[PDB]
């Protein structure tokens, strides 16, 4: 199962862009679909999503009015229109698929990039460090409409790679993902554990829920990166 995302590339500020999401395969199950973008080395940041019958749309504040998405399950595509495009729009764009109402994202595309030329927040620590071995927390607090309502998600980025899920209800573990991660929350934060540090844990993490006064809206932590240490961490 493979999401593949295309339409991307260079745009005249002011113009309209198509972007759409397909799919390698079809599921038996009902899926809405989400836009995710990431500006060149930045956050991620939820755009929008669409039900699976396209009756429910919801939009993040910086593309209501302009971005419009939409489906077609008989082609099995998922669009997003995006108009009066800006510079600040300027980001490679995910599609991600979340089953019902579960709010986390198992599938992402590969992400397309799109360029405009002009010519509540979940916090994060922004930067954790360890040596190979040790144990590393990282915090994502948030207030009661976000975190204090609903589950806590974590996605790891390894560098250069899309988004991938780690943490999904607080604490549960996709197939895949060891025991050395795990996770917790308590009242109006999270905290994301990794023990027995390794060299391919070196990349971004982000905590992620939903807003809103019916949680209809996604949210993603500001993100932490995590740097391995080539070091000891003995005395001498
Ligand atoms: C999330 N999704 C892609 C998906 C879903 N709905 C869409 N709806 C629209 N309108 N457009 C799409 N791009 C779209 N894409 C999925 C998810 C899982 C499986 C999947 O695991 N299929 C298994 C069977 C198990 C299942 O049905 O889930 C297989 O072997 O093919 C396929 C597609």
């Known amino acids: 199962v493979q999401l593949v995302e295309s339409g991307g590339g260079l745009v005249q500020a002011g113009g309209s862009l198509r972007l759409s999401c397909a799919a390698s395969?079809?599921?038996?199950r009902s899926w809405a679909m989400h836009w995710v973008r990431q500006a060149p080395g930045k956050g991620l940041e939820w755009v929008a999503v669409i039900s699976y019958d396209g009756r429910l749309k919801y939009y993040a504040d910086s593309v209501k009015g302009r971005f419009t998405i939409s489906r077609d399950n008989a082609e099995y595509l998922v669009y997003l229109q995006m108009n009066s495009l800006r510079a600040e729009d300027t980001a490679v764009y995910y599609c991600?698929?979340?089953?019902?109402?579960?709010?986390?994202?198992?599938?992402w595309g590969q992400g397309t990039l799109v360029t405009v030329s002009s010519g509540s927040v979940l916090t994060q620590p922004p930067s954790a460090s360890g040596t190979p071995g040790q144990r590393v927390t990282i915090s994502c607090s948030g207030s009661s409409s976000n975190i204090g309502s609903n589950y806590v998600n974590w996605y790891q980025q390894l560098p250069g790679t899309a988004p991938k899920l780690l943490i999904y209800?607080?604490?549960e573990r996709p197939s895949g993902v060891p025991d050395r991660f795990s996770g917790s929350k308590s009242g109006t934060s999270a905290s994301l554990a990794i023990s027995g540090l390794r060299s391919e844990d070196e990349a971004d993490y982000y905590c992620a829920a939903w807003d809103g006064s019916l949680s209809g809206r996604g949210v993603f932590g500001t993100g932490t990166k995590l740097t391995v240490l080539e070091n000891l961490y003995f005395q001498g």
């Open positions: 395969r079809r599921s038996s």
């Open positions: 991600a698929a979340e089953e019902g109402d579960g709010g986390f994202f198992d599938y």
């Open positions: 209800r607080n604490n």
